[PDB]
């Protein structure tokens, strides 16, 4: 079924186009444990994040083939879909690098 291929700590954000500001995903400020899940049977991937403190799901988005993953900084990465821009503010450079690596692995399978 769903296999986690990476676990990283990051604050999930979404971009507020109008106010030109990033806002906490799910409106819940704080860090989340973010996984990239590989659905073995369907061979599809998705990013899922839950708040570290209360486990609330803040992000659950598919990773489509061709996705352009941008590593804005050493600790902030982002990507988008037709509706919004997602951003991950990692708890550390190590968290960012490992997540980026897993994303590239997922994209290698998709592309």
């Amino acid at each position: 079924s769903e296999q986690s291929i990476c676990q990283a700590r990051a604050a999930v954000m979404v971009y507020d186009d109008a106010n030109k500001k990033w806002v906490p995903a799910g409106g819940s400020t704080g860090f989340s444990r973010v996984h990239i899940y590989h659905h073995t049977g369907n061979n599809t991937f998705r990013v899922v994040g839950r708040k570290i403190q209360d486990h609330q799901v803040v992000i659950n988005c598919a990773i489509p083939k061709g996705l352009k993953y941008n590593q804005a900084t050493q600790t902030f990465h982002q990507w988008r879909d037709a509706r919004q821009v997602y951003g991950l503010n990692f708890g550390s450079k190590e968290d960012a690098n490992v997540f980026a690596s897993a994303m590239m692995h997922a994209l290698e399978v998709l592309n």
Binding site: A72, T73, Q78
Partner: peptide, 5 residues
């Protein structure tokens, strides 16, 4: 993409 935080 928009600028980071």
């Amino acid at each position: 993409f928009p600028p980071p935080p």
